RNA sequence: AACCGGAUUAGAUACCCGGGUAGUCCACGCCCUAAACGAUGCGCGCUAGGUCUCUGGGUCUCCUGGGGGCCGAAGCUAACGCGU
RNA sequence: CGGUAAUACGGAGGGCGCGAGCGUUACCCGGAUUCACUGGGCGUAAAGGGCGUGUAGGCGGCCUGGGGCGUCCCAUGUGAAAGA
């Protein structure tokens, strides 16, 4: 449960849009691009994974959050690989702070799914049959990963704290730990446990999340075969 | 367990076609008199619904107050906007000498002796906000020691 | 001259039993019995939430009216308490409890406060062998507060000391019931008084 | 020309600590050096050391800060919460031994310049000497 | 400008149209005002950056000065906003 | 406040505050950090002088040494009495 030679994947990103606060993890500027110090990555990785294994084998709940077009279908699988919830299509304002109200939409989703497995789907008129059709369609679109949250998460995992800052801001306010994959354009101070690296470039995203979920299930003694998410590279 | 005192309420009218339509502002202090106080500001269409919100918002956003023999460890000044609040420790047998607003906060905090002066903008809302941040910045000789231990 | 008039009307306005009437504040006639609401036409109307000054004001009256003193002597006693060393709160009470007219009642020589006042004012009270007819006279610890043998045969005196038989006195006082003597041992503490008055409220009334 | 090197040094530290710099340099001076000594003794700075920059002597001041805090604004609590130059040029401040203030009811210091040297408010009072009131630090 | 006319208009002591003197230009001497505005006095030290541009130097994807703009860290501000 | 239900006018009942006093007017300090030493400000609220030059004055980078005027410490004399 580690990696060394990953310089072959994840070197750097974000030519110069850099947040200055990220300077401590920058190695140099090669061909006009910020290259992230590779040793500094693993240093924050160890401090991050130890917290993960601790929270994992404690029984906690980690909200995996990623809306990037790159990280959409990788978050879907690796969070399903674990028992963790995920956010895929869009992060809704109040998913944490308004978690009470956002959860009531899950009750409608469960209600309409339950009423769509019952014989009563055709007992309603044709017009209500297409309306409640559209409800389940969008309610499953956004909440497919958020479905599994019974309480507020014990941890949050994000792949671009810059683009997901609406999600980090809430975890901050609710004092929920923020675990992040953060490249040059991210503010490091907002991340409790940071992994410096490309927020784009799928080749490296699949590696971090898989090794993350690999480390989660290893903490619970459910050792898993390789991740199915490797076929999404090409 | 939890005592709450009402600072003030207001009419806060809003203009619309045909006539004005108003909200209600409500400011409520919450305290246990054991060193824990909270402040909250409610807005609702009817008066009581405003105090309810204030009682809820004040139970969130609490402040641990380090009471030393019923007073503050040290004097501090706090500028919130144009409003400035000043707090100074008092020997017992003095009492809470404060405006209407700071007295309500500090009494529910558990302070029995303190000296207070409001300055600049005497606006109650800002005074309350200022007095709060004043209490968030209190430190103990143990606290300040643990900052310089290294 | 102090306040003179209806008393158990002021039992009502303070909302707390005021034993200035002496007896009959104990018997169920005090008008605190089955009439706790304040006097006047609007006494039975629902009272509005008192202002922060309203509370401080009523608490002072609740204390001042209990000893039966004008505001003049009352205020001066406070300004004396703030200068002396110690807690302004408790020291002020001990100064009130040092009033001769108040000690006379506290010693059970008289039934009420007003009654103990008249006993002093007419010279029936002895302090260390001399007559002292001033109700405002402050008693020092150790002074003997006695009854003039001229009055020891008065039926009003033998009346109150008859019910004082077996009755206990405050821990800062002691009395010989037969010879009609008495002694002020020490200044009472805050705990020594059961007065239903928050003193910090009264101090806070005077910071303004 | 620089006007008040002490306020300049007092500010150079004030400014560096608000953005949480690891270190900052101040033009080297013996009087300044005695100031920094009191701060390193009283635990407001990690310490200091002489250094040259482009040949000219300077003093690296290593700041210290509190623990990284909880939800929003994780920035740590300052070790130096306040620094103010008291006796400036154009209005000098000299206090006798009985005129020395108690800083933040004892939790802070008052750097005094005295005939017996640069002392904190406490050191100056047990020495029984007053002098120029340099600054508050708390 | 003034003023002489023509219109417009309820009226036109104006806007519009035809004229037209001082003046506007030059020299020499006065006058000393202005929204003379960045409505922000001068000098020096300190405090993230990104980008556009004028002008120097440089081992000339760029680095480094000195100006002129725009976003914006921390912070300040009653707010707008200010922000090397 | 009062222009038809006035707790604001005028009286009554009642209530509150002081009580041999209670109100009023004038005057002083206070609240007033509203002349800001403690303890304020001037982009738009009152407030940067139209700009420069430069006199007086105010202010003064780093190292050593003498002096000891400012500054600090001790002793002493003085600081009448009353007051506090
Ligand atoms: Mg931990
Ligand atoms: Mg959305
Ligand atoms: Mg990015
Ligand atoms: Mg605390
Ligand atoms: Mg201000
Ligand atoms: Mg104390
Ligand atoms: Mg004002
Ligand atoms: Mg006093
Ligand atoms: Mg003394
Ligand atoms: Mg006292
Ligand atoms: Mg006292
Ligand atoms: Mg005793
Ligand atoms: Mg007073
Ligand atoms: Mg004409
Ligand atoms: Mg005409
Ligand atoms: Mg017309
Ligand atoms: Mg001029
Ligand atoms: Mg200025
Ligand atoms: Mg060039
Ligand atoms: Mg420039
Ligand atoms: Mg800007
Ligand atoms: Mg900001
Ligand atoms: Mg009528
Ligand atoms: Mg009417
Ligand atoms: Mg009528
Ligand atoms: Mg009336
Ligand atoms: Mg009337
Ligand atoms: Mg009457
Ligand atoms: Mg009298
Ligand atoms: Mg005045
Ligand atoms: Mg003044
Ligand atoms: Mg004042
Ligand atoms: Mg004025
Ligand atoms: Mg000033
Ligand atoms: Mg000063
Ligand atoms: Mg001002
Ligand atoms: Mg102006
Ligand atoms: Mg100008
Ligand atoms: Mg001007
Ligand atoms: Mg010098
Ligand atoms: Mg000079
Ligand atoms: Mg000398
Ligand atoms: Mg004298
Ligand atoms: Mg004397
Ligand atoms: Zn009674």
UniProtKB/Swiss-Prot annotation, chain A:
InterPro entries linked: Ribosomal_uS2, Ribosomal_uS2_bac/mit/plastid, Ribosomal_uS2_CS, Ribosomal_uS2_flav_dom_sf
Presence of keyword Isomerase: no
Keywords in alphabetical order: Coiled coil, Ribonucleoprotein, Ribosomal protein, RNA-binding, rRNA-binding
Annotated Gene Ontology cellular component terms: cytosolic small ribosomal subunit
Quaternary assembly: Part of the 30S ribosomal subunit. Contacts protein S8 and may contact the N-terminus of Era.
Record-linked HAMAP family: Ribosomal_uS2_B
Protein name: Small ribosomal subunit protein uS2
Organism name: Thermus thermophilus (strain ATCC 27634 / DSM 579 / HB8)
Swiss-Prot record, chain B:
GO molecular function, one term: rRNA binding
Entry keywords, A to Z: Ribonucleoprotein, Ribosomal protein, RNA-binding, rRNA-binding
A GO biological process held by the record: translation
GO CC term (a single one): small ribosomal subunit
Domain S5 DRBM: from-to ranges: 2-65
Disulfide bond sites: none
Gene3D superfamilies attached to this UniProt entry: 3.30.160.20, 3.30.230.10
Pfam families reported in the protein's UniProt record: Ribosomal_S5 (PF00333), Ribosomal_S5_C (PF03719)
Classification via PROSITE patterns: RIBOSOMAL_S5, S5_DSRBD
Lineage: superkingdom: Bacteria
InterPro entries documented for this protein: Ribosomal_Su5_D2-typ_SF (IPR020568), Ribosomal_uS5 (IPR000851), Ribosomal_uS5_bac-type (IPR005712), Ribosomal_uS5_C (IPR005324), Ribosomal_uS5_N (IPR013810), Ribosomal_uS5_N_CS (IPR018192), Ribsml_uS5_D2-typ_fold_subgr (IPR014721)
Quaternary context: Part of the 30S ribosomal subunit. Contacts proteins S4 and S8.
Description of its domains: The N-terminal domain interacts with the head of the 30S subunit; the C-terminal domain interacts with the body and contacts protein S4. The interaction surface between S4 and S5 is involved in control of translational fidelity.
Function, in words: With S4 and S12 plays an important role in translational accuracy.
Miscellaneous comment as given in the Swiss-Prot or TrEMBL entry: Is positioned such that it could physically interact with spectinomycin.
Family: Belongs to the universal ribosomal protein uS5 family.
Protein name as annotated: Small ribosomal subunit protein uS5
From Swiss-Prot, chain C:
SUPFAM superfamilies: Alpha-L RNA-binding motif (SSF55174)
Keyword Metal-binding: yes
GO cellular component: small ribosomal subunit
CDD domains named among the record's database cross-references: S4
Keywords per UniProt: Metal-binding, Ribonucleoprotein, Ribosomal protein, RNA-binding, rRNA-binding, Zinc
Pfam family, one: Ribosomal_S4
One of the protein's GO biological processes: translation
Molecular functions (GO terms): metal ion binding; rRNA binding; structural constituent of ribosome
Residues covered by the S4 RNA-binding domain: 98-160
Cofactor binding, per record: Binds 1 zinc ion per subunit. In a number of structures (e.g. 4Y4O, 5FDV) a 4Fe-4S cluster is seen in place of the zinc cofactor.
Cofactor(s) annotated in UniProt: Zn(2+); [4Fe-4S] cluster
UniProt binding sites for Zn(2+): 8, 11, 25, 30
NCBIfam families in the cross-refs: PRK05327.1, rpsD_bact
Cited function: One of the primary rRNA binding proteins, it binds directly to 16S rRNA where it helps nucleate assembly of the body and platform of the 30S subunit. Binds mRNA in the 70S ribosome, positioning it for translation.
Subunit annotation: Part of the 30S ribosomal subunit. Contacts protein S5. The interaction surface between S4 and S5 is involved in control of translational fidelity.
Similarity-based family: Belongs to the universal ribosomal protein uS4 family.
Protein name per Swiss-Prot or TrEMBL: Small ribosomal subunit protein uS4
Organism for this UniProt entry: Thermus thermophilus (strain ATCC 27634 / DSM 579 / HB8)
Swiss-Prot record, chain D:
Keyword Transcription: no
PROSITE patterns: RIBOSOMAL_S8
Cellular component per GO, a single term: ribosome
Range of residues in the leader sequence: none
Keywords: Ribonucleoprotein, Ribosomal protein, RNA-binding, rRNA-binding
Molecular-function annotations in GO: rRNA binding; structural constituent of ribosome
GO biological process: translation
Keyword match Ribonucleoprotein: yes
Transmembrane segments: none
Alphabetical list of SUPFAM superfamilies matching this protein: Ribosomal protein S8
InterPro entries recorded: Ribosomal_uS8, Ribosomal_uS8_CS, Ribosomal_uS8_sf
Pfam families, A to Z: Ribosomal_S8
Quaternary data: Part of the 30S ribosomal subunit. Contacts proteins S2, S5 and S12.
Family that this chain belongs to: Belongs to the universal ribosomal protein uS8 family.
Function: One of the primary rRNA binding proteins, it binds directly to 16S rRNA where it helps nucleate assembly of the platform of the 30S subunit central domain. The combined cluster of proteins S8, S12 and S17 appears to hold together the shoulder and platform of the 30S subunit.
Protein's UniProt name: Small ribosomal subunit protein uS8
Species in which this protein is naturally found: Thermus thermophilus (strain ATCC 27634 / DSM 579 / HB8)
Native organism taxonomy: Bacteria, Thermotogati, Deinococcota, Deinococci, Thermales
């Amino acid at each position: 449960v580690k990696e060394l030679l990953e310089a072959g994947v994840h070197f750097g990103h974000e030519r110069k849009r850099w947040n200055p606060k990220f300077a401590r993890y920058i190695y140099a500027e090669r061909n006009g691009i910020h290259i992230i110090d590779l040793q500094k990555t693993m240093e924050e990785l160890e401090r991050t994974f130890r917290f993960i294994e601790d929270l994992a084998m404690r029984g906690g709940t980690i909200l995996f959050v990623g809306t990037k077009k790159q990280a959409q279908d990788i978050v879907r699988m690796e969070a399903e690989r674990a028992g963790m919830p995920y956010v895929n299509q869009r992060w809704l304002g109040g998913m944490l702070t308004n978690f009470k109200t956002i959860s009531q939409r899950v009750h409608r989703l469960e209600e309409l799914e339950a009423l769509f497995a019952s014989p009563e789907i055709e007992e309603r008129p044709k017009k209500e049959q297409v309306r409640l059709k559209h409800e389940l369609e969008r309610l499953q679109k956004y909440l497919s990963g958020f479905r599994l949250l019974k309480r507020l998460p014990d941890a949050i995992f994000v792949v671009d704290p810059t683009k997901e800052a609406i999600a980090v801001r809430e975890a901050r306010k609710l004092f929920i730990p923020v675990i992040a994959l953060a490249d040059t354009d991210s503010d490091p101070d907002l991340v409790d446990y940071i992994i410096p690296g490309n927020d784009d470039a799928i080749r490296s995203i699949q590696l971090i999340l898989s090794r993350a979920v690999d480390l989660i299930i290893q903490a619970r003694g459910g050792v898993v075969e390789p991740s199915p998410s490797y076929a999404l590279v090409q | 367990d939890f005592e709450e005192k009402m600072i003030l309420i207001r009419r806060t009218a809003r203009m619309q076609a045909g006539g004005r339509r108003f909200r209600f502002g409500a400011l409520v202090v919450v305290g246990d008199r054991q060193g824990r106080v909270g402040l909250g500001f409610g807005k609702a269409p009817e008066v009581p619904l405003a105090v309810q919100k204030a009682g809820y918002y004040a139970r969130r956003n609490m402040v641990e107050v380090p009471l030393q023999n019923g007073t503050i460890p040290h004097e501090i000044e706090v500028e919130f906007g144009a409003s400035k609040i000043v707090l100074k420790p008092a020997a017992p047998g003095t009492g809470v000498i404060a405006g209407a607003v700071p007295r309500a906060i500090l009494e529910l905090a558990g302070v029995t002796d303190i000296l207070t002066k409001e300055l600049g903008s005497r606006n109650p809302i800002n005074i309350a906000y200022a007095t709060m941040e004043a209490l968030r910045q209190l430190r103990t000789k143990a606290d300040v020691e643990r900052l310089r231990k290294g | 001259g102090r306040y003179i008039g209806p008393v158990c009307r002021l039992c009502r306005r303070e909302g707390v039993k005021l034993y200035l009437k002496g007896e009959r504040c104990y018997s169920p006639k005090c008008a605190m019995e089955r009439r706790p609401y304040p006097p006047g036409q609007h006494g039975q109307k629902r009272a509005r939430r008192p202002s922060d000054y309203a509370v401080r004001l009523r608490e002072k009256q609740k204390l001042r009216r209990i000893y039966g003193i004008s505001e003049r002597q009352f205020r001066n006693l406070f300004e004396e308490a703030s200068k002396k060393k110690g807690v302004t709160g408790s020291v002020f009470l001990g100064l009130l409890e040092s009033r001769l007219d108040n000690v006379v009642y506290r010693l059970g020589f008289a039934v009420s406060r007003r009654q103990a006042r008249q006993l002093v004012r007419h010279g029936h009270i002895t302090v260390n062998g001399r007559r002292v007819d001033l109700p405002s006279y402050r008693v020092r610890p150790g002074d003997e507060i006695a009854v003039a043998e001229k009055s020891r045969n008065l039926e009003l005196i033998r009346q109150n000391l008859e019910a004082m038989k077996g009755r206990k006195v405050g821990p800062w006082l002691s009395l010989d019931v037969e010879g009609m003597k008495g002694k002020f041992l020490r200044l009472p503490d805050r705990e020594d008084l059961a007065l239903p008055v928050n003193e910090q409220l009264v101090i806070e009334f005077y910071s303004r | 020309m620089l006007t008040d090197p002490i306020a300049d040094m007092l500010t150079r530290i004030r400014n560096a600590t608000r953005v949480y710099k690891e270190s900052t340099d101040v033009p080297a001076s013996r009087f300044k050096e005695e100031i920094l000594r009191i701060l390193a003794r009283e635990g407001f700075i990690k310490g200091y050391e002489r250094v040259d920059v482009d040949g000219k002597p300077y003093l690296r001041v290593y700041l210290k800060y509190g623990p990284r805090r909880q939800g929003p604004d994780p920035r740590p609590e300052q070790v130096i919460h306040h620094i103010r130059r008291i006796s400036k040029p154009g209005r000098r401040v000299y206090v006798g031994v009985k005129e020395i203030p108690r800083v933040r009811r004892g939790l802070g210091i008052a750097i005094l310049s005295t005939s017996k040297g640069v002392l904190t408010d406490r050191e100056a009072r047990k020495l029984g000497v007053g002098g120029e009131l340099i600054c508050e630090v708390w």
